[PDB]
Design a protein around this ligand. Sequence first.
Ligand code: ADP
Ligand code: LBP
Ligand code: MG
Ligand code: MG
Ligand code: MG
Length: 672
Amino acid sequence: GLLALGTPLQWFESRTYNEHIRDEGIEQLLYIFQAAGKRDNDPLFWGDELEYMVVDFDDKERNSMLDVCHDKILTELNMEDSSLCEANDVSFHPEYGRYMLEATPASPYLNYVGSYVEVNMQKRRAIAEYKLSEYARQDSKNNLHVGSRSVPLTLTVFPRMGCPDFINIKDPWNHKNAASRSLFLPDEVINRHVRFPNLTASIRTRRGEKVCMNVPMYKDIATPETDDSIYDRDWFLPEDKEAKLASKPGFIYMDSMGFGMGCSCLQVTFQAPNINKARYLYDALVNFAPIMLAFSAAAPAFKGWLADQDVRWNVISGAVDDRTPKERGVAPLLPKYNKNGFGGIAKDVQDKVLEIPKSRYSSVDLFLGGSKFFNRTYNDTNVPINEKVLGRLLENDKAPLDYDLAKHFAHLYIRDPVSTFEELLNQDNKTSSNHFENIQSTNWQTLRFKPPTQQATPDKKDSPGWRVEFRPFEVQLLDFENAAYSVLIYLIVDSILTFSDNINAYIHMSKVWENMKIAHHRDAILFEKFHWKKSFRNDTDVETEDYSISEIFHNPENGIFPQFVTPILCQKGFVTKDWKELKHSSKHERLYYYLKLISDRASGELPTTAKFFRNFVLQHPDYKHDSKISKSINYDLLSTCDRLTHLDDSKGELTSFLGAEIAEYVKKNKPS
Ligand SMILES: Nc1ncnc2c1ncn2[C@@H]1O[C@H](COP(=O)(O)OP(=O)(O)O)[C@@H](O)[C@H]1O
Ligand SMILES: CCCC[S@](=O)(CC[C@H](N)C(=O)O)=NP(=O)(O)O
Ligand SMILES: [Mg+2]
Ligand SMILES: [Mg+2]
Ligand SMILES: [Mg+2]
């Protein structure tokens, strides 16, 4: 669904309501617990969110651009073509990028739904390409976007973001981009819904410096020693003078929110039976997050460069990192503009500013606890909290909370609201969660623990309950892959929820954080090791060893297949003994190829999308052994991606990417 209208407040004007917004959202949250705290026996509803990028192929010029001119698609799919969507069980909404689409099923899946995830993902995609073909008929007749061919691709990263000729707007630099003030992204990369340029502007003003994301450059025989795309400019002070100071030799420099929030992911959200199981599930999924990031890697290039990393995470982390240099415990790059390293923080609250170790977009900070295996000593890392919020969640007359749950919320509330509408400044806290949502939705982490609304009282059985969002997955090109990875986590969640008396997944948080750094390394999946529990079926045991992704998926004692997946499949009767029995299942064959694809990637038998892209660039005739992705390499890569998406093996690319057995299989068998 399309986002409702508002008048955003810009940072200088909105910062004055930070405490008001925090206070009133805490009250809203208290009403939610008071109303929905005792929900129970909620069904296992779940659903995915896919994010897409609309790419314009200029086949005559050999240039694939991002398409920032067909964003009406989102309004039309939510207006006069919404009937198409509803009939087809899909729903569409905006994302940060003006070229992006997001789509979900219109109703959650319930329990195990087989091939229907993939069916539903194919329908989302077929409806987007339908709309796009309609525009191509209109444009033809109005003689517009002549030569151009727009295709939705589930890319994690656009390899040429912020590089010359990367958007289908002639001469986008003939005006200034006051929102991001980036050297590379015109503000047309941003979706027109006012929230998005608001967040962009708000986060930069608060920080008092452009966002800054330095990603290690892959080092080839002829790679420049610096990011030679940086340039001096004079539109904006201080921002146009930052790059010289902020960049680093051997690092890709990115300076704008769209480099991160202009990237895409797969997400899956699950409803637990009640809040307690929701805490248990959340805690248990914490170390799956860095593992699945590493496993799904789909981002080996940024801003026209091959990177020495394989996932998007740290780039998105920096893109919305509103921390002043004070909060980061570093000097302002330009002390004359960034007064005392406080950026846009009001002086009459600079005395309350904390040093905060992680960006508001970062891995989970705290186990919620509240289950039998939990011990507060597993929360062993630096996690600042808003003490006032903790105090109030502990002592109040609506819903006093246990200390571990209170500390989760209090950590979330160390942040300021960065997107605030004038209209919404005073709410009815009994019925509204908008203020709480303000902070909740702008703490972006590897999981999200989702309260219901005040409306979701236990008697109302169909309301959304206590939910856990699983956020780390990179998005893959094929709907077959995304459904494989969606069902994977489904089966892991069902496993956790089913065997909850016996699964101890606790490890020290400091280890998870370390895993998150390791998951970024180039080819991590193929050789790096990760702290993973030695056993899950052991009261009090929180011993880890360091296991490869292959061992983490396949070890009999602690592996995802033998301890999570296979046990749930036996238990639900899909198999007697082993997951591989599905190959010869009459009802369940596709589930076999889903799992086989996963296992073969986890063992290094099939490449990740990140590796496939990297090979593609490195093996390209025009590649100049210097780390650069040119318009021409970009064009061929994305043509390949278009063929892969569409199971087009005419050039053997699908066989090359999925191997013969899976390729032949998806080419001859449609999900149904
Ligand atoms: N009751 C429910 N339990 C679990 N998941 C749900 C439920 N209702 C909807 N979902 C799924 O939650 C996700 C919500 O998507 P979205 O509106 O994109 O929210 P957000 O951006 O906050 O994650 C979708 O995948 C949707 O299918
Ligand atoms: C600025 C708005 C961001 C909304 S978002 O957090 C983006 C997810 C990101 N594209 C990623 O690759 O991790 N998805 P949702 O809010 O639909 O869960
Ligand atoms: Mg969403
Ligand atoms: Mg999203
Ligand atoms: Mg989401």
